Amino acid sequence: RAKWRKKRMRRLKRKRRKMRQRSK
Amino acid sequence: GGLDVLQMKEEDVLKFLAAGTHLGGTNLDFQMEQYVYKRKSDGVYIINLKKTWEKLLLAARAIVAIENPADVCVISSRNTGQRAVLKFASATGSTTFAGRFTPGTFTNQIQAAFREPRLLIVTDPRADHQPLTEASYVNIPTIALCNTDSPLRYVDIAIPCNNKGPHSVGLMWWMLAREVLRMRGTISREHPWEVMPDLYFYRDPEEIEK
Amino acid sequence: GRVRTKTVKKAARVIIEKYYTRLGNDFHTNKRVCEEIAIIPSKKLRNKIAGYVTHLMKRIQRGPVRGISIKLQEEERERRDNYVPEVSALDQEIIEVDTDTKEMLKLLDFGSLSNLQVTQPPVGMNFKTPRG
Amino acid sequence: GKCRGLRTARKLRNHRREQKWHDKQYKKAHLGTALKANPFGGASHAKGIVLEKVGVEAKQPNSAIRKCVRVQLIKNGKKITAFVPNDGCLNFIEENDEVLVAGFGRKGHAVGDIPGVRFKVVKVANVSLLALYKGKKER
Amino acid sequence: TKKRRNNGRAKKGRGHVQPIRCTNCARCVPKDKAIKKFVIRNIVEAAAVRDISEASVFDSYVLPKLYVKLHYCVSCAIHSKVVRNRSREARKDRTPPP
Amino acid sequence: PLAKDLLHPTPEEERRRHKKKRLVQSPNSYFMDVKCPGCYKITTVFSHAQTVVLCVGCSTVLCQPTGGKARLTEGCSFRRK
Amino acid sequence: VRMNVLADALKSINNAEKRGKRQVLLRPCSKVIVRFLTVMMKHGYIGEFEIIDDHRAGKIVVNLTGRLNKCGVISPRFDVQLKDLEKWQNNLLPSRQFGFIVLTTSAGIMDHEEARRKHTGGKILGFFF
Amino acid sequence: MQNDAGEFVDLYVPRKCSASNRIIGAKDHASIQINIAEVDRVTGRFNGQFKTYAICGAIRRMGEADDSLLRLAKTDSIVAK
Amino acid sequence: WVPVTKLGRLVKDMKIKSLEEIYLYSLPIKESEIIDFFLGSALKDEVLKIMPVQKQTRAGQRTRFKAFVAIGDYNGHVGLGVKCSKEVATAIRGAIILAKLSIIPVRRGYWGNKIGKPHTVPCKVTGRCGSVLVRLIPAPRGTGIVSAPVPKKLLMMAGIDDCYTSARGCTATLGNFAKATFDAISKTYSYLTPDLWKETVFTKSPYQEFTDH
RNA sequence: GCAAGUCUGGUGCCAGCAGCCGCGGUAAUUCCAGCUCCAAUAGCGUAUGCUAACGUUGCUGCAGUUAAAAAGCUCGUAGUUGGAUCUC
RNA sequence: CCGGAGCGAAAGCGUUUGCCAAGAACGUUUUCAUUAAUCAAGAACGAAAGUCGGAGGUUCGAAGACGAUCAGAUACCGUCGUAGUUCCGACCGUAAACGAUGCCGACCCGCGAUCCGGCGGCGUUUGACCCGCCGGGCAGCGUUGCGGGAAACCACGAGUCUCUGGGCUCCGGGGGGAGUAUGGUUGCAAAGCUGAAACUUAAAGGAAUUGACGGAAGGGCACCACCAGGAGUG
Numbered sequence A: 001r002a003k004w005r006k007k008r009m010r011r012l013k014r015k016r017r018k019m020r021q022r023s024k
Numbered sequence B: 001g002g003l004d005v006l007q008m009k010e011e012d013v014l015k016f017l018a019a020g021t022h023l024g025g026t027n028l029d030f031q032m033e034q035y036v037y038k039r040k041s042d043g044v045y046i047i048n049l050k051k052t053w054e055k056l057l058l059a060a061r062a063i064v065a066i067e068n069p070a071d072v073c074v075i076s077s078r079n080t081g082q083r084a085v086l087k088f089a090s091a092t093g094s095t096t097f098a099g100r101f102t103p104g105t106f107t108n109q110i111q112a113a114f115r116e117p118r119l120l121i122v123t124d125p126r127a128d129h130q131p132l133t134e135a136s137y138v139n140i141p142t143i144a145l146c147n148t149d150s151p152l153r154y155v156d157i158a159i160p161c162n163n164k165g166p167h168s169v170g171l172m173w174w175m176l177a178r179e180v181l182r183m184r185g186t187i188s189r190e191h192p193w194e195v196m197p198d199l200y201f202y203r204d205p206e207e208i209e210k
Numbered sequence C: 001g002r003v004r005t006k007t008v009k010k011a012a013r014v015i016i017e018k019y020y021t022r023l024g025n026d027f028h029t030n031k032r033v034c035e036e037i038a039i040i041p042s043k044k045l046r047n048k049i050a051g052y053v054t055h056l057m058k059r060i061q062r063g064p065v066r067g068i069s070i071k072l073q074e075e076e077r078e079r080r081d082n083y084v085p086e087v088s089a090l091d092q093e094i095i096e097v098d099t100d101t102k103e104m105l106k107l108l109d110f111g112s113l114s115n116l117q118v119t120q121p122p123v124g125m126n127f128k129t130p131r132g
Numbered sequence D: 001g002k003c004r005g006l007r008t009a010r011k012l013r014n015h016r017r018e019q020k021w022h023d024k025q026y027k028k029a030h031l032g033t034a035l036k037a038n039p040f041g042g043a044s045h046a047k048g049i050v051l052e053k054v055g056v057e058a059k060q061p062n063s064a065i066r067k068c069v070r071v072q073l074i075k076n077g078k079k080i081t082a083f084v085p086n087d088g089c090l091n092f093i094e095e096n097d098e099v100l101v102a103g104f105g106r107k108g109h110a111v112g113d114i115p116g117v118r119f120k121v122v123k124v125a126n127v128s129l130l131a132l133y134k135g136k137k138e139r
Numbered sequence E: 001t002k003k004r005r006n007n008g009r010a011k012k013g014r015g016h017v018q019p020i021r022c023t024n025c026a027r028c029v030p031k032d033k034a035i036k037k038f039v040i041r042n043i044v045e046a047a048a049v050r051d052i053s054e055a056s057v058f059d060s061y062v063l064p065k066l067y068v069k070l071h072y073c074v075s076c077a078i079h080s081k082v083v084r085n086r087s088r089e090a091r092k093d094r095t096p097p098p
Numbered sequence F: 001p002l003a004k005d006l007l008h009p010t011p012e013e014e015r016r017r018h019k020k021k022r023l024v025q026s027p028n029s030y031f032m033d034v035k036c037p038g039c040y041k042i043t044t045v046f047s048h049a050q051t052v053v054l055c056v057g058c059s060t061v062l063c064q065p066t067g068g069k070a071r072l073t074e075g076c077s078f079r080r081k
Numbered sequence G: 001v002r003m004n005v006l007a008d009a010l011k012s013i014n015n016a017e018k019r020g021k022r023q024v025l026l027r028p029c030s031k032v033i034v035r036f037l038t039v040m041m042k043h044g045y046i047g048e049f050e051i052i053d054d055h056r057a058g059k060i061v062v063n064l065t066g067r068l069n070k071c072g073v074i075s076p077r078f079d080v081q082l083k084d085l086e087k088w089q090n091n092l093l094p095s096r097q098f099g100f101i102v103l104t105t106s107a108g109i110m111d112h113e114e115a116r117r118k119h120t121g122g123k124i125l126g127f128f129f
Numbered sequence H: 001m002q003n004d005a006g007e008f009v010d011l012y013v014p015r016k017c018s019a020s021n022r023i024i025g026a027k028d029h030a031s032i033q034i035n036i037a038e039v040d041r042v043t044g045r046f047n048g049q050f051k052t053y054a055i056c057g058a059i060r061r062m063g064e065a066d067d068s069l070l071r072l073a074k075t076d077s078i079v080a081k
Numbered sequence I: 001w002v003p004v005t006k007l008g009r010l011v012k013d014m015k016i017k018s019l020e021e022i023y024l025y026s027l028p029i030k031e032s033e034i035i036d037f038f039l040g041s042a043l044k045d046e047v048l049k050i051m052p053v054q055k056q057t058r059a060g061q062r063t064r065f066k067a068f069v070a071i072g073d074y075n076g077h078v079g080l081g082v083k084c085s086k087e088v089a090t091a092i093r094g095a096i097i098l099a100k101l102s103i104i105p106v107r108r109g110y111w112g113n114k115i116g117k118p119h120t121v122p123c124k125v126t127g128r129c130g131s132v133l134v135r136l137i138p139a140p141r142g143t144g145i146v147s148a149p150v151p152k153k154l155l156m157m158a159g160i161d162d163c164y165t166s167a168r169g170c171t172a173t174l175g176n177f178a179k180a181t182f183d184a185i186s187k188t189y190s191y192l193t194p195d196l197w198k199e200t201v202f203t204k205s206p207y208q209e210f211t212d213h
Numbered sequence J: 001g002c003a004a005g006u007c008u009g010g011u012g013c014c015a016g017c018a019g020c021c022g023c024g025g026u027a028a029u030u031c032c033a034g035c036u037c038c039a040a041u042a043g044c045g046u047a048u049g050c051u052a053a054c055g056u057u058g059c060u061g062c063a064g065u066u067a068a069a070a071a072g073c074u075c076g077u078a079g080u081u082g083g084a085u086c087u088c
Numbered sequence K: 001c002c003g004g005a006g007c008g009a010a011a012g013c014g015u016u017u018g019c020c021a022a023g024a025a026c027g028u029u030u031u032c033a034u035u036a037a038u039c040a041a042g043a044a045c046g047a048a049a050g051u052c053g054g055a056g057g058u059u060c061g062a063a064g065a066c067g068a069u070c071a072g073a074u075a076c077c078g079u080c081g082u083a084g085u086u087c088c089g090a091c092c093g094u095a096a097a098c099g100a101u102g103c104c105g106a107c108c109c110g111c112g113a114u115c116c117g118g119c120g121g122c123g124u125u126u127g128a129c130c131c132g133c134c135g136g137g138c139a140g141c142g143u144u145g146c147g148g149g150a151a152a153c154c155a156c157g158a159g160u161c162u163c164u165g166g167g168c169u170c171c172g173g174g175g176g177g178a179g180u181a182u183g184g185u186u187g188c189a190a191a192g193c194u195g196a197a198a199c200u201u202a203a204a205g206g207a208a209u210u211g212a213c214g215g216a217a218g219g220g221c222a223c224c225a226c227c228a229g230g231a232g233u234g
């Protein structure tokens, strides 16, 4: 299912934003 | 035939009006429009008898242009003209396929029945589509008693007539057999032909006993 | 399981087209013809062939079989195919010709004929079948 | 469709200019990337010091220990893996010596059943490895 | 590959049609894609119509019928044997089965 | 239909086809001089009248507005040609 | 919406010729189209065409003789000199034996052999063979 | 096709369809060459003369073979106009 | 040789003079003995490729070899034939039969000046088979055949000494490559050129000229 | 592929060969050697850049239904291209 | 009722009646008189889910509880039910938003239907129906073996393409990495738009065909199937 590769990708990008936000 | 000797006579017009050769059904082919005079009120397309007579003379010129009569072939897979092509072949000397046309008689050379004619005359283009399409792999001109709703996919001499009625199709085979013999010298064109036009008419088993 | 195989079907037909007057409607007389004419290393096979010939002979005398034909019965139908009425069905006393077909004759030279009855066209155009 | 207009020389030129970038062989040769990441830096050969002698296993469906060497370049200090081409020439390789490595067939691409080795050693100790394999230049 | 020219529905000249519900599974099926089946059967079976006929207090009473409009999805119209999988050339026959 | 003559078409085919797809365009409408019993003068009116047409003096109505040609009332003449 | 009248003219001739027609109707007419047909008619590729003189763009009915293989236009009308005319001959004509390239020199519409004899180039309209 | 000296170099000159001027190829098996016999003016018997027409397979396949022979016969006055 | 068709009977009794008489009327050559009767002296074949195709059955893979044979007299005539038979030798001989039945005349033209015998194609012709299309461009007298080894054998056996080929598509498919080249060669005598605009004078067909025989 | 050996012996998924597909798991035409043979040739291989091959950058000259692909749809300037009609 | 029928640029749109201002097509010897087509930058609209602020919350129902099944179900099945689904405003601008097929224009087959308008013709019926025709609209069938294509299939062309050039916009360059990183930018957020590289890989994929298989369908067959029983085993 290619849609859940997009579901896990949006879930990984959302975690990378929180890691990058705490380094401000 | 543009001459005055080959013009159709009164005896020919009466036979056409009696046999019903001027009725082409409710449908019309776009390539058969030039041979239709006018559509009547009940959807029937009236076939122009003058165009029928001209194509009949034109087809006879192609038959007599074949020296050997055996090189001319007549095929009728429909029962409406099975005996019409038998009497036609006996009157002119041609070959005939009166029964069921076996696919391969024109292309399969090692086959038993491998009659390869020079001119094919088809009763109904739609009912005898197999001899027509098979006459395309070999250079064989094809004449056909074409109705107003008949496909002309491989018909080079389309005779506009009613190939649906038994008396209608039987007359066209008698008219063609008469005109072919007239152009050869068998009939003097003065006295009427001894062969009656009803000899080519098909008889259904309910009236064969009568 | 009374169905014959191609060995019996073909042999029983080629023996009739070559020998028709020989075989009659009796299986026992037909059985003896196959002994002298054909060469078969089996006796049960000869009875199947001669037995099927007897079945074909009843059909031949009844009419033309769809496989082959004979020359004694074909002449009966050929003369029957040469049948012609004393008066032809075309040359009738009066021919009914519609108005539109009459104008076509008026365009040609044969516009004034004696045995032409101008039939009135049928009013209304209901020549098409209802759809659905 | 393509614009054929007589005054479309600019439209046609700019379009082909930006579409050539979508070509892999063109974009790798006309950008900073694929040149700085290349250990040779656009060179055909390179010298290096033999650091280790590692035997990499070939890929399926093959089974053979490909004899290579972990070599550190002298020109830029990068560490690569040069493949010992011939048979038994790994024994001819000395430890901590100069070797002239070159490309391995396909440009920047692993050749054969070797997983990721894309370099091969040409000379060893300022002499050709081919001579060491054919009983010449005894060193 | 495109299996049907009409994509298995009757949407020509439109972009969206009203979806309806199935019967034996209750699935949202488009109106043009639904497998229509107008079932018209008697209220009483033919095997039991004679018992109701003799028990009728009247002389001649025609038993009414059950006019039911059924909708089937593709996955259920085949399981319920309403429609079958036809040959490649047989699928083009839009004529209802006799 | 391969050798169909295009420069000399039959007058029936020209009259049947569209008013623009002919060899030379020609209007399909016409003018008529409606002669009602009220006004004795000849008053030309377009076929697709599209409006309530009245003769000189305003005696009676001539044409009711329709989609195509005008629906003439009882007692109207023709093109008179 | 047209952008060219000579393109739709030669496209109608090319299609009707391949469909076996004997005459083709060209909806728009122009002096460039008429002089284009004259170059083909002078070399024996079309018959005697009749210009329907209407008070509009005008129509032309061309008599097709079947001798034509294909007639097309070269859009846009590139400026062809005499030194590069040999290049267009190898890209548009079937062979050096037949086929002509219709150029628009300063002396009027003509083929490529007439332009070489007159020693003058111009804008290219199309070709026919 | 000559060789600038009057020598024809083609090994055979193919036929052209009398209906569409198309060259009848060597494997155009759907093509025909029909002969339309000539008759005498006073009697109407076959006098050994005939008008030969060739039709390519493409025109014959589409159904334009009967209309072509009909028009080609009017050109030679074989059939009435 | 016992002829089974009326065309083979005429050429057996020396009624048809040259093989070009059959091409003039487009008669189907159904007997391979007709081909070796006229051009049997100088006719060199060549097996282009034996491509074994397999039919997956329950027993595994049923191998059946195809044979692409090119036949040409090296002047004006070339033929291509395919045959899929169980045995390799049977497929080759069967393809030689079909390569003769499919032989066709190829027209040869001139590049620029017409001096001597024709050497190249008359014009640019294109043949198509599947996806691969080839184009034969006329070339000078001393350029030779500029093509791949596959279409070169067809152009040499067709008598074409010089040709410029522009082959596109999946030319790796030798089957469609040869049939596309053979289809372009067949279009040389179907291309209407100004040197063929002369009104053709019809003659008697061999079926009509020898109808009594 | 691509012109030239099911040649000889051992090495046996090991060592290796191989640009690609692929060759070795005890009769390897591939490898480890001889003979012989082959485009060769005073030159010949290898690595990398680049050109043709490549109509796989398509102006000539490619593609965008299903193989990579027409913006969800329409408006809209610049840009691009624009109906017929003036001494032949 | 409701259809392979209409309308709209699309998304989309069907209970009655009323109100409101649009739109194609057709009609036209009206009017205007080339005022065009396609369109970077820019903009309206854009199913559903989601988001913020109110109302209302029937049913359904993310989540969630519980009941069943399984070796294990955090599911399908069942009960129940939050958000949501409904309405109001501001956002979000994403769909297999598909005809997986840009717009405009010419040319290029046939037939029978269908939709709107116009036109002219026997009749029936106080517009309805009948037979045609011209113009666009959704489509269909037949031939594509007049072409196109790898083929499936294509006349809402996917035809007029090596015989290559009607105009214009967007967009693709082996499969992965990856619609990821980074930068800019929009947004309340979720995220949208723009968009890489290193590296890895000899295939990935399209169409079609023959086998095998299906827990797919249909048909047919045998007391190693049953029916009817009869023996015997357990």
Ligand SMILES: [Zn+2]
Pocket: E021, E022, E023, E025, E026, E027, E028, E029, E071, E072, E073, E074, E076
């Ligand atoms: Zn459902």
